[PDB]
C-alpha cells in the first residue's frame, strides 16, 4: 500500500523529472521494456509504491507531466527514457505562460486544470491506498507558479486529508532572469503556506559554484546541474522505495520534520561531493559523511547554515553500516555547539539506512532539515517585492489578467508575517 502519485508540473519540473526516474529505474533494476531485473525483496517489494503493474510484467511510473509548452516536454517524449510513461500523462499546452503568474491561473488555468485533474483520477484508480502527492516546480517559472499553485489548490477539493510533499526551486540571489521574479515568488508562496505541509528549497544557480569548486567542472550546464539534484531527490525517497530497519515513509516524514505546520521550508542536500577523477582516491567513513552535511559546502540553496539554528534533523544513509556510530558522533556536537541545535530535544539527528548502494558512489548520506536559513532568503524576496510594488512597476501585466492592487497587498502582509514567524525562535 501507501501509493504516491507524482506530478511534475512546470518547465523546471520536467527537467528534474526526466532524471528523477533514471535513478529509480536503475536502483530497482526495472527494465523499461522487459519486466524486472531485481534480486530480492529490497528492490522488488516496493515496486507497487511508485509503479502500477500492467498485465504482462510491464511497469508504468505513476507520473504526470504538466507543461504549458509543446517544445519543452518533447524532450521527455522520446528522449532519455521518456517513452515509458502513459500516453495520457503528456498533457501539452499550446499557450505559453510567458513567466507570468496571473496568466497561468486565469487564462491558461481556466481551461486546462479540469483536464489535469482527470489524469490524477485515472492514476488513483490503480492506487489501493493513496499516501499522497509530490509536486516538483519552480518559483521563477510561469508554469511552475501558474500550474503549480492552481493545481495544488484544486487537488485539495478531491484530496483534503492527504499529505503533500512539494518540491520548490527557489530563485537565485546572485543572478536574475526577469524583473517579475519577485512577483512570481511572492504570489506562489502566499498560497503555499495556506494548506500545504512540506516544501523544499533548491537553488540551481547556487550549484554552479559547487560544480566549479568541488565537482571540478569548468563549463557547467543544465545537464550537469540536474545530476546532483536527482541524487538529492533519491535520498529523500530512499526508505520510501527500499525497506529496512528504520522504516519511515512520507507519512512518518510529514510529522518528524516540522514541530509547526506553517514553518515547513527545508534545506535539502547530500554528501559526499566527488568529481569524476578524484572519487576513487577518497575513502568514505561514518563520521566523514555525517560531519559534512552540517557545513555550508553541502547546501542545495544559496544560504548559510553557520549563522542559523536547526529544528529537526533527518539523515538517510546508503550502505550496510553501523548506525550506532551516527548518534554518538552527533551527540558530541550538540554539547559543544549547542547554539546551533535545539536545547530540549535529546535526539536531534534522526537515523535512517537501507541495504541498496547508490549509483557511482559507494556510501552516501542526504541532509533533510529546516532551520532559520530560509528566513534570510525570505527577506530578500520581500525587499525586491517592496521596491517594485511601491512604484507599481509592471502591474498592468498582472491586473490585466484578473488581479488587483489589493491582491498584492494581501500577498505582502502575510509574506512579511512569515518573516516574523521565523523571527521568534531565531
Amino acid at each position: 500500500m501507501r501509493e504516491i502519485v507524482h506530478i511534475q508540473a512546470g518547465q523546471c519540473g520536467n527537467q528534474i523529472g526526466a532524471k528523477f526516474w533514471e535513478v529509480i529505474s536503475d536502483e530497482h533494476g526495472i527494465d523499461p521494456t522487459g519486466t524486472y531485473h531485481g534480486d530480492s525483496d529490497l528492490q522488488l517489494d516496493r515496486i507497487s509504491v511508485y509503479y502500477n503493474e500492467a498485465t504482462g510484467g510491464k511497469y508504468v511510473p505513476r507520473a504526470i507531466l504538466v507543461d504549458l509548452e509543446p517544445g519543452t516536454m518533447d524532450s521527455v517524449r522520446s528522449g532519455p527514457f521518456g517513452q515509458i510513461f502513459r500516453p495520457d500523462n503528456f498533457v501539452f499546452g499550446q499557450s505559453g505562460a510567458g513567466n507570468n503568474w496571473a496568466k497561468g491561473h486565469y487564462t491558461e488555468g481556466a481551461e486546462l486544470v479540469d483536464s489535469v485533474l482527470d489524469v490524477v483520477r485515472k492514476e488513483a484508480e490503480s492506487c489501493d491506498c493513496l499516501q499522497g502527492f509530490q509536486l516538483t516546480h519552480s518559483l521563477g517559472g510561469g508554469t511552475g507558479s501558474g500550474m503549480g499553485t492552481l493545481l495544488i489548490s484544486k487537488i485539495r477539493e478531491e484530496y483534503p486529508d492527504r499529505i503533500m510533499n512539494t518540491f520548490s526551486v527557489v530563485p537565485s540571489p546572485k543572478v536574475s532572469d526577469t524583473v517579475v521574479e519577485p512577483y512570481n515568488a511572492t504570489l506562489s508562496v502566499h498560497q503555499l503556506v495556506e494548506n500545504t505541509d512540506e516544501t523544499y528549497c533548491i537553488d540551481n544557480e547556487a550549484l554552479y559554484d559547487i560544480c566549479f569548486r568541488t565537482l571540478k567542472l569548468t563549463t557547467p550546464t543544465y545537464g550537469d546541474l540536474n545530476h546532483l539534484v536527482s541524487a538529492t531527490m533519491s535520498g529523500v525517497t530512499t526508505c520510501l522505495r527500499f525497506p529496512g530497519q528504520l522504516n519511515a515513509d512520507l507519512r512518518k516524514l510529514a510529522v518528524n520534520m516540522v514541530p509547526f505546520p506553517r514553518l515547513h521550508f527545508f534545506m535539502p542536500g547530500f554528501a559526499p561531493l566527488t568529481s569524476r577523477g578524484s572519487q576513487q582516491y577518497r575513502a568514505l567513513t561514518v563520521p566523514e559523511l555525517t560531519q559534512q552535511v552540517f557545513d555550508a559546502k553541502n547546501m542545495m540553496a544559496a544560504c548559510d547554515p553557520r549563522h542559523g539554528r536547526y529544528l529537526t534533523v533527518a539523515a538517510v544513509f546508503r550502505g550496510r553500516m553501523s548506525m550506532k556510530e551516527v548518534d554518538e558522533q552527533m551527540l558530541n556536537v550538540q554539547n559543544k555547539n549547542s547554539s546551533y541545535f535545539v536545547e530540549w530535544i535529546p535526539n536531534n539527528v534522526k537515523t535512517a539506512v537501507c541495504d541498496i548502494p547508490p549509483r557511482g558512489l559507494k556510501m552516501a548520506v542526504t541532509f533533510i532539515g529546516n532551520s532559520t536559513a530560509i528566513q534570510e532568503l525570505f527577506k530578500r524576496i520581500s525587499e525586491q517585492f517592496t521596491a517594485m510594488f511601491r512604484r507599481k512597476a509592471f502591474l498592468h501585466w498582472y491586473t490585466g489578467e484578473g488581479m488587483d492592487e489589493m491582491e498584492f497587498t494581501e500577498a505582502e502582509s502575510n509574506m512579511n508575517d512569515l518573516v516574523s514567524e521565523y523571527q521568534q525562535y531565531q
Binding site: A54, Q94, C127, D128
Partner: protein
C-alpha cells in the same frame, strides 16, 4: 523613427507600413482556411512536435495548431476562440469575413482615402445588416424534425456524410431528453467517451452513463441487472487524524488490538452500506452499485464483495451530477441519514474490458435527463474528428432550441444581405458611400468560397444566384452538387441565428480596429 532613437533594438512600422502588415497577414490566414469551408472542404493533417496526427478541418483547431508567429494572426485567433466557445460553429466563416473586410478596404485606402472613412461605412452597413437578419429568420417552434436538418448542416461540414447520418441521430436525440419547460440546456450533462471497439460509424447514444473505470475486485459481479445506485462522496479508504497522533502499545497482544480498533471507524461506514442492502427486501437478485467518488481500500472492497455489492472508486466531479439525475437518488456526503429514498435504479449495469481497461455501463433508466455519446473510433486521430464534430453539433442544436427562430443556409443569407446594402448605399449621404460597398462585397465571400471548394466557377455562380434573388422573393442559395441556385429553406439546409449575428458584430469591430492601426512596434527590452 522615434522608437529607434530611444531603444535601438525595437522594430517599428509606420502608417503606410503597418497597414500592409495586417492586410497581407489576413490574406495569409484567408487563403489557408478557405479550403475547408462547407461539406466539399478538404481535411487538414496537423502534426505537432511529438509526431501525433491531428486530422481536422475546424477553423478553431486550425488556427491554434499552426506554427505561425505573427501579431495579426494572434488577433484573429482570439476572435476565433470565442466563436468556438459560446456557440460552436461559425469559426471558418469568421476568418473569411475579416480577410475580405481588409482586402476590399485596401482598394480604397490605397487610392487616396483615409482608413477612418471606411470604418464609418462599416457601422452604417452593420445597422442595416442587423435589421435585415431579423427579417429573414424563420420561427419553426423547435420541431424535432427541424433540429435534424440543423444538426445535419453542422455535421456534414466535418465528416464525409456517412457518419453524418449516424451522428445526427446521436446529437438530436441527446439534446431533447435533457431539459423541458423552457429551461436552459446544460451541456455538462452529456458525457463524451472515447472508445476503440468497432468502427467510426458505430457511435451510439447511451441513455444512461458510461464510466471509464470498472470494479476493483475480482470477486465482484460483472453484469448486474435491476441495480440500486448508491452515490457516495465519503472516503472508504484508511485516513488518519488531522493532528499527528500515532500509536503506543506495550505488549504484542495489544498490537493486534490497535489494528482491529483503527479500522472500526472505517468498517462503521461499510456496515451502513451492507445494512441498506438488507432493508430493500433482499430476497431476490437486488444488485447494488456504489460509484464512490473517493477511494476505497481493498479491506472494504473485500467486505462488500462477500455481500454482493459492486463498488467502484475514483469517479469524476460531474459524475455526482450526471448520475444523480439519471438514477434519481441523492449524492450523499455522509452515512448518517441513509434511506431508500436516496437510492437510484437502473435496469442493467454491466462492464466491458478493452485492453486491460474496463468501462462501466449504466443503462435502462426511466427519465434520465443525462446521456452519453459513446464514440468508438478506430484510430486515435479519428476520435478527435468525431469529438470536435459532436461538440460542434451539440452547440448548434442548443442555440436552435434557446433562440426561437432559425436562420437559412449557405447562400440564402449572405447574398440577400449584400443586395440589401446596394439599395441602401445612397442612404448614408456622405463620404462613407464606399464603406457600404466594401462591406457588401465582403459578405459575398461565403457563396464564393463554397463555389470554389466544390469545383465550380466563382464569378459565373455569383451572377446566377444574384439573378434569381433580384427576379424573385425567395432567399436562394448555393448548391454544392450542380451549381444551380437552389433555395436553402426548402432543401433542408439551415443555420443558427446567433452565429450570423455575431459574424456581423465580432468581425466588424475587429476590422474597424485593425484598419485604425498604424504603429505596430515591439518594445519592452
Amino acid at each position: 523613427a522615434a522608437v529607434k532613437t530611444l531603444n535601438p533594438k525595437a522594430e517599428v512600422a509606420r502608417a503606410q507600413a503597418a497597414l500592409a502588415v495586417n492586410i497581407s497577414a489576413a490574406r495569409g490566414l484567408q487563403d489557408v482556411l478557405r479550403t475547408n469551408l462547407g461539406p466539399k472542404g478538404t481535411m487538414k493533417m496537423l502534426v505537432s512536435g511529438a509526431g501525433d496526427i491531428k486530422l481536422t478541418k475546424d477553423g478553431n483547431v486550425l488556427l491554434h495548431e499552426m506554427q505561425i508567429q505573427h501579431p495579426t494572426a494572434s488577433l484573429i485567433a482570439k476572435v476565433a476562440t470565442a466563436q468556438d466557445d459560446i456557440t460552436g460553429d461559425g469559426t471558418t466563416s469568421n476568418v473569411l469575413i475579416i480577410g475580405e473586410l481588409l482586402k476590399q478596404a485596401d482598394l480604397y485606402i490605397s487610392e487616396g482615402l483615409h482608413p477612418r472613412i471606411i470604418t464609418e461605412g462599416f457601422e452604417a452597413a452593420k445597422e442595416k445588416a442587423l435589421q435585415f437578419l431579423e427579417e429573414v429568420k424563420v420561427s419553426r417552434e423547435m420541431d424535432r424534425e427541424t433540429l435534424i436538418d440543423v444538426a445535419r448542416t453542422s455535421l456534414r461540414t466535418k465528416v464525409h456524410a456517412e457518419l453524418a447520418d449516424v451522428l445526427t441521430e446521436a446529437v438530436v436525440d441527446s439534446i431533447l431528453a435533457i431539459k423541458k419547460q423552457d429551461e436552459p440546456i446544460d451541456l455538462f450533462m452529456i458525457e463524451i467517451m472515447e472508445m476503440k471497439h468497432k468502427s467510426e460509424t458505430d457511435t451510439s447514444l447511451i441513455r444512461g452513463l458510461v464510466l471509464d473505470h470498472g470494479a476493483r475486485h475480482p470477486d465482484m459481479k460483472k453484469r448486474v441487472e435491476d441495480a440500486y445506485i448508491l452515490t457516495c462522496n465519503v472516503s472508504l479508504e484508511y485516513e488518519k487524524t488531522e493532528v499527528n497522533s500515532g500509536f503506543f502499545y506495550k505488549s504484542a497482544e495489544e498490537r493486534e488490538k490497535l489494528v482491529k480498533a483503527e479500522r472500526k471507524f472505517i468498517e462503521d461506514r461499510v456496515k451502513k452500506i451492507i445494512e441498506l442492502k438488507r432493508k430493500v427486501c433482499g430476497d431476490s437478485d437486488k444488485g447494488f452499485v456504489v460509484i464512490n467518488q473517493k477511494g476505497i481500500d481493498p479491506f472494504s472492497l473485500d467486505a462488500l464483495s462477500k455481500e454482493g455489492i459492486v463498488a467502484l472508486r475514483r469517479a469524476k466531479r460531474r459524475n455526482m451530477e450526471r448520475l444523480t439525475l439519471a438514477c434519481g437518488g441523492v449524492a450523499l456526503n455522509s452515512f448518517d441519514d441513509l434511506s431508500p429514498d436516496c437510492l437510484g435504479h437502473a435496469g442493467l449495469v454491466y462492464e466491458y474490458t478493452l485492453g486491460e481497461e474496463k468501462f462501466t455501463f449504466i443503462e435502462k433508466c426511466n427519465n434520465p435527463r443525462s446521456v452519453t455519446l459513446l464514440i468508438k473510433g478506430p484510430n486515435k486521430h479519428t476520435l478527435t474528428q468525431i469529438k470536435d464534430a459532436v461538440r460542434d453539433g451539440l452547440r448548434a442544436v442548443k442555440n436552435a432550441i434557446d433562440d426561437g427562430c432559425v436562420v437559412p443556409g449557405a447562400g440564402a443569407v449572405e447574398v440577400a444581405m449584400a443586395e440589401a446594402l446596394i439599395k441602401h448605399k445612397p442612404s448614408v449621404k456622405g463620404r462613407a458611400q464606399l464603406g457600404v460597398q466594401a462591406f457588401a462585397d465582403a459578405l459575398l465571400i461565403i457563396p464564393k468560397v463554397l463555389a470554389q471548394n466544390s469545383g465550380f466557377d466563382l464569378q459565373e455562380t455569383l451572377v446566377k444566384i444574384q439573378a434569381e434573388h433580384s427576379e424573385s422573393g425567395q432567399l436562394v442559395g448555393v448548391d454544392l452538387n450542380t451549381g444551380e441556385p437552389m433555395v436553402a429553406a426548402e432543401v433542408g439546409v439551415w443555420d443558427n441565428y446567433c452565429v450570423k449575428k455575431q459574424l456581423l458584430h465580432s468581425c466588424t469591430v475587429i476590422a474597424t480596429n485593425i484598419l485604425l492601426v498604424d504603429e505596430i512596434m515591439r518594445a519592452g527590452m
